[PDB]
Each structure stands twice: as C-alpha cells, then as structure tokens.
Design a protein around this ligand. Structure first.
Ligand code: GJY
Ligand code: GJY
Lengths: 602, 605
C-alpha cells in the first residue's frame, strides 16, 4: 500500500546502490512536433505525463511514500570547522583588493612561458597572467587583441547561425572597452590583473548593453535589462572586457546545448559532438581559446557538465557564495554563478573577483568569510596530504565508458602516492530520491518565473525541447514540492555525516564522454530525457544541497575526448576544493590541442 | 492596469496610493444530498478540474499565481531580523525546566487574593475560576484534585459530552483521569506539589499526540495508519508540572474548517448559544474551557484555529510566534504557519500555560534563532508603565469591514479606553496587498496538509474522509508546484510590508472575526457543509499572524445585541509575547468577562 522511511536511523551497511536509469522516448523532427502537441493537448496530455512519472518511479516517491522529515526548502549548513592553510579575505572588500590577495596565493609568474620559449614544447592554454604580463610589458595591447578576436568571430560566423559561440555580440562595444583599457596601460595605471582580460557572459545573466534572452527569441520583449548584474558589475570594475552574451540551451532546460532558435554550439574537440548544457557557448568559446574565462550558471550541472566534455575547468561555488542579483535564476534554491576557465589559475582569479554574498543571503545563510588557497608553499604538504577523499565505488564505476572510470582512478592513485591522500570508502544513500527531488526543485521556480509570459501567448515561441519539459513541470503539484523538500533534508543529513569522515567527495563528472549530435535533431531540437539525465548522474549532489564542487580535466579517452573529474567539498570550503584541484592539474595537465583552436597572443 | 500580464513592485510602493480591496470570496453553499453529488463531481475526472479551475478563476487566484510577475525571491519560512529588546519584561532562559519557569511567572503575576475564592459577598458578579484559585483550594485542603475529577466526570457522563451528537471530547477515559488525579491528590497530602499547574485540568486537541489516547485529528481512521507511541513536546512539559490531561478535544476534521463541523463525531455547540457554531478548528478545546470544565486547553493555529473559536466563545487564545513552542508530536509539524497555542478562560491562565509549554525545538533553535523568552510584569511595576508608551497600529478601512456594526464599535470602545486610562497612541496604518495574503495563505496551509496524508488517501482511505475535507482536498490538489513558489514570493512582500509597519507601531489591533457566532443550518448537521464564503470570512483578520509568524492574541472585549462574545486581536513584533500579553492584560482590566454563558458548570462549588 505505502512505503515508510526514517532518515537518521539507517544502517549504512544496509543501503544498496540503486541504479535506475531514466526511461523516456527519443524523438526528433516531425514526431517531436506531434509529441509536443500531444503533451500540450487537454485530456491525453495529462495521461502521457502521468505515465512517464509512474514509469520512472516518481509517483511512488512523491505520492506513495510517507517521509518523517520536515521540509528544508533552502540549503541549511551548520557551523563548519575552519579550513587549514588558507588566507582569509573580507567578503565586502572591493574586487580589486581581493585580486591582489589572490595574486599572493598564486605561485610566482615566470616570464619564460609567454615570450621566450623552446619551439619544441607541448601545448597549453594562455593563462590570464599571460595576457596581463604582455599588456604591461608593451608586447601587445588589449585593442590589438580585441581586433584579432573580432576578426575570428566574423571570419567564421561565430555570432550568427548555424554554429555560433555568441548570440549577442557587438564588435563596436568590444573595441570601445578595449580602447579605454589600452589607454590605461599606456598611461601606466592598470586597474587590476583582470584589466584587459576578455570574459564571456552567459545569456541568462544581465550585462549591459545587451539584453537577456536566456536562449529564447522573445525574453527581451517582456524582461528588459536595466543595470549590470552583481557578477558583471564586479568584473567590469576590475577592468575586464565583456565580449558578449553566450549561446546556451534554452532557459537552461537541458544538458546538451541544443538550441533550435540560434543553432547548436559545436564541441571544439570534435565539431560533430555536443558541448554540454546549458552553458554550451561559454564552455566552447573558452575551450577554443578565444577568451580567457567565462561566467555561467549551475542549477543542475550547467557549469561542470560542459566543462568536462570540452576539457576546461568549471567552478561551482557554494549556494549563496556569489551574488545572483541580475540573472534569470535568482530566487532559486540550486542555482549559482560559477566561472568556466581554461586553467585552474584563471578560474581562481575570476572567483576572487565575483564572489560576495548578497545582502539578503548574508543574513539568512550566514556564510563564512571567503578563503583563498595557498597554491604555492615550499613547506611540506600540510593540507593536501591530510585530506580524506570519499569515494563510492559502486557509484564511481557506474559509467557508460570504461575509460572514464579508470582515468579518474589513476588520478586517485597519483594523489595518494605523490601526496599521501587517504581514499576512504563512503556510501550515498537514497540516490533515486535525490534525482526526483532535484528535478522538481529546479523546474518549479523556472516554470513559475515564466508562467505570466507563457499564459500571455509567448508559450508557442518556445522550442519543442522546453515545451516538453514545461509540460512535465506543470504536472508537479504543490504537495509534490513539499515532499521533495523533505527529501532534501534526508540527503542533507547523509552528506553531513559523510563530511565528518572525509573532507571531499571525488567522483567522475559525467557518465560518458562528449555525445554525438544526431543530424535530425538539428532542425527543431530533440527530447532525450534518458541522455539528458545520464549526464547529471554525478552533479545533482552539489546543486540540491549547495556544496561547492569543481570539474577538472584528468586526461582523454580512446577517441581523444576529454574526461572530467569532480571534487565536492564541505560547505563554504572552496579553498579546499580549489587547492586539491590545483594538485590534480599538476599530475595530469591539459596536453591535447582541440580541433577548433585559435592562438591569440602571437 | 490588468491587460496582458500584471507587474508588481514591493519595497517601492507609496502607502498613500494603496487602496483597500474588500471582501471577494465567492463559493456555493451546498448541504445534504446536493453536497454529496458536488463532491462526486469534484472528484470526477474531467469535470472535477473544470469546477476547481472555475472557482480559482472566479475568485482571482489564477490571475495572482499565474498572470502576475513578482520581483521577489521566495521566502519559504518566516524570516525575522534582529528585534529591539522589549522594555519592562523579565528574561527567563529557554533551557530551564517548565517547573522553573512557572515559579518565575508566578512572580510576574499580581499578588493572589484569597477573598475571591473561599469567602466573598453573595451579591457579586460572574467570573471564571482562575488557575490559582484551584491551586489555592488544593493547597488549603478546601478540595482535592480527586474530588474535582469526580465532579468533571459526573458532568461529562450526565450530559453526554464524550458521545454524539454534541460532544466536548472525542477520546475520554474516566479511569485515566482518576488515575492522574489520585497521584496528584497524594502529592498535596504528602505536602510536595510539583508546581502551580499540579492538579489543573487541561484538554488536548485531537491532532496533538497525548498518551494513551490515539491521534485521529477529527477523522476515524488516522489511528489505523499513524499510531502514537510517546507524548508530544507540549504534552510532556505539561505532564511534568503535574497537570491532568482530561482528554482529546473535538475538532474540525484535520483542521480543514473554521466552523467546527465534524460529521463523524458531531458538531460541538457554543456554550453561549447551543444553536450556534463554536468556531474552528479547535471547536472542542474552546467549548470545554468556556463552559468552565477545565481551566485551559491546547490547540493549533495555522489560520486562526485558536483565535477564531476564542472570540466566538468569549475566552482568550494565545497565538505564539512561529517556532516559539515545540510542535514535535502532532499532525501539523513541519509546516510554515502552524503553532501550538493555549486557550484559557482568563489572561492569567493563558500566561501560565504559555510559560509551561514554551520552548523552541532543537531544529528551530538553529534556523530561527529566537530571542530568550520574556514574561511581562503584569503588576503595576512602575506607574505610567510601558503600556502607555505603545503605538497601536490600526487600518480604519480594514477595521470596519465587518458584517456586524456592534463588533466594530465595541472594539473601538476599548481603544478609547486604552488611550484614556494608560496613554496609548492610535496610529493609522495601511496593510497593502490584502488579497495576495489570503491567496498565499490558503496554499501555504493546504499543500503541507495534503502532502502529509497523500499516501494514506491513495491507499484507499480518501473515501473515509468527510465531504468537507474532500472539498478542500479537491481544491488543494489543483495547486501546482509553480503555484507554491509564487506564493512564497508573496510571503516576502507581506513580510517587508509588516516589518515597515512595526518600525512605526508596536502592535496591530483589529477585531478577531468579522462577525459574531454564526448560526448552524440544521441541514449541515447531516453530512457537513461547504461554505467557503463564511469559512474565509472568519479568517479575514487572523491570516497575517500565520503567514508571517507574528504572535497574536484574542481577548473578549464585550458582547453584541443578542449577547454573543466579541473578540479583539493584538498582533505584536516577533518573539514579543510579553508585549502582547501585557497589553492584553490591560484590556481585560477595562472590560472583564461578566456575562455567564448558557451552558456553564461550576466546578469548585
Ligand atoms: P543547468 O544547471 C542544466 C540542468 C538540467 C535541468 C533540466 C532538466 C529537466 C528535465 C526534463 C524533463 C524532466 C525529466 C524527468 C522528469 C520525470 C519524468 C519525465 C520523463 O541549467 C541551469
Ligand atoms: P486552522 O488554523 C483553520 C484554518 C482554515 C483551514 C481550512 C481552510 C481551507 C479552505 C477550503 C477551501 C479553499 C478555500 C479557498 C480556495 C480558493 C478557491 C476555492 C473556492 O486549522 C489548523
């Protein structure tokens, strides 16, 4: 009849790894169009959605299970222990000041990796300090860099269909910012290290003068941008150059990057393969090397998923660490603003510039003061060696590719021998509940935000991929949301008891490499909940609970596709995750040059 | 303007622009057989949804939840900032035992007068027996708790107050009451009473766990699936003070009503007028106290279920701050509007029961971080005390929107009496977005209740509920997940409005209900009734304290034409129960309860 639960009294040796993959049809082209109309149809529409929910065990969890826990609507963290060997910085200091403290945590820059080098060395991306050193040594100017970037955008059509990196780009505004930045390097007063650095903002974050469409073709008609967002205003005050708005999966409803209105962004490592969603353009423009870093959102993996598939670094901050004022996902309970950079050094600098909780979340979440990891230290490995790396073996190997489970396993052995890390076995109970509780916790705010727009007639202007998801989200009742928040408390009490034994939780970022794009889906989208969910089977933990996580390249598989490793640490412990990730890049640096790559500084 | 989509703004509205939007609730009044078919239509597949969506479209709820962009981030649970410490109050630790707080609260009370219990002039007025009157008679050996228990049990059996059609209690065991009274009587003979509440009779609502009686919540099957095994937090504290748990009170089924109509156990009748309703959902708790059987009772208040019956029956009900009292061991735990509040015959009794049951849960202590409990110095501690230096907020349009000219003036008489006898300032205020508060409340209370019992109803137990509950559940299943998000966005708007009001005033005074005791239609006694118009009209003042968490209280302030009780509500700042209790104490001084109800039982003789 009904199933009974009790959270804080389960035996961890009793929890069995339940691996239920998602079951949904794979429709493209015309059959997708008719399927969307059947879902939006009156009577038959509700039957198809209730069938999909009961087939995937969601009705059994929300409606046929009594949960004794009280709802935890927003992530609630206890007072954490202070992390060891870190530099505390003020949370309300100017981003120009935090960039200087961060410059002290980085190892000393050596000029032998930019100007003069042996022409028989390996491949590496350009660090932010490589541009900063060249701007200050009068080797190049941000104006000449902007011209070379704009030259590539227009030569290859990366600002127009079918394969764009940016969906809102203005060359005249890029030159306007690079001129004022160049004249500050000539007068001898650069603002900070980020002065002259090109960054790309995702289309769901406000950034003047471009409007915020969120991947749609009509959001600027009902939601006009007034001022810069909290993260862009901080970046702009450091002298950064906003390149433009990035292509994304429509409204973040997808983990592939399919956009049937502007085009599907292609993976720089293989143009016939997806980039990963939803920050598709942000990840591709950084992997291609056009810009140094990019800002994106992550309410279900939209920062780490496209970072692992494209071979870059994506930082997912703690819930509330970065101010979300001025974006489409503000007010949610899983989303944050995270950077996507080519190397760890670049992502750390951007994190130092954009961090800072909002005035509201400061009084509700009570965050700890920000910390910068001392990435360089001649003393013994004080913190790196004394870390316990939690690992769920049955969850670690459940991947659709034997290459990514062993290439991550090689890094763990490399971490234990070259530093002394203890790999502790853990168990993550109720993994199917965390997926069901997450999908409703991400969709309900998104559907509510656009509900007055859809009922006014703008629902037909959405892609078939979004309308299919919104049809499922309308099935979630208010009682279903309450039960999901009660599940969020259970998953919280489990992970808190895990973080008392281990410091981080290492897992592969995705369960597969860069997937192939079916040629029929390029005409109007596709519904593939099986593959969309399969990409989130490792990142839903940090979103639903708010823990900070990161994605780092750890090598490549058989066909040369990037492999991503995830490191999720304690709340507010970005410095712990950043420092550990810095050692992972030291053991397995990015070496393969992607197919679509552009060298700027030359 | 309302053309395509509506657009809002919160912390930038002009309070001089806000105009009062009055009563709007429209719904059918169906009883008997027409009620049964209407329920079958609502539970019918296709036509059931169209009727609900019509009622949501007709009452303007769909335009609020679906056709209005709200520029606020959702506030799921009541968030309060740091409050200014209330003046002239006694601070007591939140960790002390309930017996220790009782001795501290006894110091705050004025000196007891034995000339009001044993020896008095036989030509005086009417007055309820206070808790200290029982404690005096027990300790002076004028009577024992065993003799008092035999007197109460004699009345319950003689008038069938534990049986249909008009019961006060739905779970009553006479053998258990004597068992608790025997142990209480010995402690007075041995000379070691536990506290002042030792020997006092209190009644627990049926949705609160209280051994050995099971918890049904007004239903007839909830004990089959939810069995109680230990006392609740509020009951275990009262039992540690020597209180006598009289039994589980009658209530509206699962708190889904504000009238007290229960077609499974009967409808409890108002002691002032048996042909009239008691007010819900704590119908039995308020009737057994107003009748003089027990000194106090425990009930819930998620939408006025403590204040509404207290005003209709002529007693005092204390709605504490959200999180102030532990709700562990009840059917409403984990909510966002409900609390456990006492219902007593006098302010002195409610203040003592509040001191014994208070105490935030270990989870709510960390998330809400409440200030330490404070007890008001009820005696004349200063002379021209802080009572006069209080600003009373009043919304004149909202104050007078009542379906009876008597309750609007009898409450206005108390305000003039407070200003002349103490010096209170009556500041005019405005409460913006009153219709949004009603919409955001009903979904915030209905969704967790429906989610609590969803596995039981889908297991076939949905047919065993009354038609009144199934009517509400048919509406509650219509609230989508996106509708709940927008409702919490409205909770933040009403919060920023009321917080800016508390920057100017200390409390907000309004009438408790917009009408006196309504008459029970003789057809509703068959299988309940659906009357959302009256069910909502009784909550038009008490929803602000539930959706936002502010403490409120309902105090009798006189009677109307036909001799029915009138209630006045005082809602204060968060965690400021002492401010609300102190001002309410002065109100009972200026207008005490003088009319004896029809059904009344003197216990001490
Ligand atoms: P990111 O953080 C991308 C994260 C993915 C969010 C979108 C997922 C929605 C899935 C679509 C439909 C629902 C899937 C399963 C529901 C249950 C049964 C239906 C098959 O973006 C910001
Ligand atoms: P208390 O704190 C009593 C509070 C009232 C709870 C039950 C009220 C439910 C109302 C019934 C139906 C819904 C009313 C309006 C919805 C909108 C349109 C429907 C016509 O109990 C603990």
């Amino acid at each position: 009849y009904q199933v009974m639960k009790r959270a804080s009294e389960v035996d961890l040796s009793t929890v069995k790894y339940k691996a239920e993959t998602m079951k949904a049809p794979h429709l493209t082209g015309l059959s997708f169009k008719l399927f969307v109309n059947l879902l939006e149809a009156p009577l038959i529409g509700s039957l198809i959605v209730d069938y999909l929910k009961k087939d995937n065990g969601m009705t059994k969890i929300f409606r046929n299970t009594v949960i004794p826990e009280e709802p935890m609507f927003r992530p609630e963290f206890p007072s954490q222990e202070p992390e060891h060997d870190v530099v505390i910085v003020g949370e309300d200091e100017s981003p120009i000041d935090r960039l200087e403290t961060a410059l002290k945590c980085l190892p000393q820059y050596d000029p032998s990796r930019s100007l003069h080098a042996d022409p028989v060395s390996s491949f590496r991306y350009w660090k932010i300090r490589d541009y900063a050193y060249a701007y200050r040594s009068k080797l190049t100017t941000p104006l000449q860099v902007a011209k070379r970037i704009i030259s590539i955008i227009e030569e290859f059509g990366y600002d127009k269909p079918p394969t764009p990196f940016l969906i809102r780009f203005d060359a005249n505004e890029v030159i306007k910012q690079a001129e004022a930045s160049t004249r500050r390097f000539e007068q001898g007063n650069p603002i900070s290290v980020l002065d002259g650095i090109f960054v790309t903002i995702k289309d769901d974050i406000d950034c003047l003068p471009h409007p915020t469409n969120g991947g749609t073709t009509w959001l600027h008609e009902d939601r006009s941008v007034e001022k810069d967002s909290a993260v862009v205003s901080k970046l702009r005050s450091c002298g950064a150059i906003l390149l433009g708005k990035a292509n994304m999966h429509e409204l973040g409803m997808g983990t592939t990057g399919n956009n049937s209105n502007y085009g599907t962004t292609r993976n720089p490592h293989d143009p016939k393969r997806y980039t990963g969603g939803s920050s598709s353009g942000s990840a591709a423009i950084v992997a291609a090397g056009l810009c140094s870093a990019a800002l994106g959102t992550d309410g279900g993996g939209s920062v780490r998923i496209p970072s692992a598939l494209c071979g870059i670094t994506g930082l997912k901050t703690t819930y509330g660490r970065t101010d979300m004022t001025g974006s489409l996902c503000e007010g949610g309970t899983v989303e944050i603003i995270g950077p996507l950079a080519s190397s760890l050094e670049d992502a750390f600098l951007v994190y130092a510039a954009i961090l800072g909780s909002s005035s509201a979340d400061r009084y509700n979440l009570k965050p700890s003061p920000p910390c910068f990891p001392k990435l360089l230290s001649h003393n013994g490995s004080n913190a790196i060696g004394s870390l316990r790396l939690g690992k769920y073996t049955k969850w670690f190997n459940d991947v659709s590719s034997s290459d990514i489970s062993d290439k991550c396993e090689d890094i763990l052995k490399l971490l234990s021998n070259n530093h002394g890390c203890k790999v502790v076995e853990i168990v993550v109970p109720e993994l199917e509940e965390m997926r069901a509780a997450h999908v409703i916790s991400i969709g309900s705010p998104t559907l509510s935000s656009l509900t007055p727009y859809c009922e006014a007639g703008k629902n037909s202007k959405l892609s078939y991929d979004t309308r299919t998801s919104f049809a499922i989200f309308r099935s979630f009742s208010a009682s279903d949301y309450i039960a999901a928040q009660c599940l969020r408390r259970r998953l919280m009490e489990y992970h808190l008891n895990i973080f008392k034994d281990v410091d981080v939780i290492v897992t592969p970022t995705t369960g597969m490499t860069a997937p192939v794009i079916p040629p029929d889906a390029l005409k109007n989208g596709e519904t593939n909940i099986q593959v969309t969910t399969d990409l989130m089977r490792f990142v839903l933990a940090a979103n639903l609970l708010g823990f900070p996580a990161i994605s780092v390249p750890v090598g490549y598989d058989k066909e040369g596709l990037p492999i991503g490793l995830q490191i999720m640490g304690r709340p507010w412990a970005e410095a712990t995750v950043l420092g550990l990730a810095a050692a992972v890049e030291e053991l397995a640096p990015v070496t393969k040059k992607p197919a679509i790559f552009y060298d700027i500084l030359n």
